[PDB]
Amino acid sequence: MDETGKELVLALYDYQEKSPREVTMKKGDILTLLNSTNKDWWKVEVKATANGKTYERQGFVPAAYVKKLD
């Protein structure tokens, strides 16, 4: 698994993606931080299981609900 070993953020409040170019999280969840160039939204990589395979996808999350564990 080469999708966990750089940065991660903790999810304070649950979320609910609305677009295909976005992700979601749950209270007490952890997402691998990818980019934080912004101050309102952060780019994290989530995981998903389909067709009997595990793959990760990129998305954006509210920095107001999530906080890096740096």
Task: Show the domains of the chain with their CATH numbers.
Answer: 1-70 (2.30.30.40)
The residues, ordered by sequence, that sit 6+ positions from 14 with a Cβ below 8 Å of its Cβ are 24, 25, 26, 27
Q: Experimental method for this entry?
A: NMR
For residue 25, how many C-alpha atoms fall within 13 Å in the half-sphere facing its CB? Answer: 28
Name the E strands within the chain: 8-11, 30-35, 41-50, 53-62, 66-68
The residues, ordered by sequence, that sit 6+ positions from 60 with a Cβ below 8 Å of its Cβ are 21, 22, 23, 41, 42, 43, 44
- C-alpha 68/C-alpha 9 separation (Å) is 4
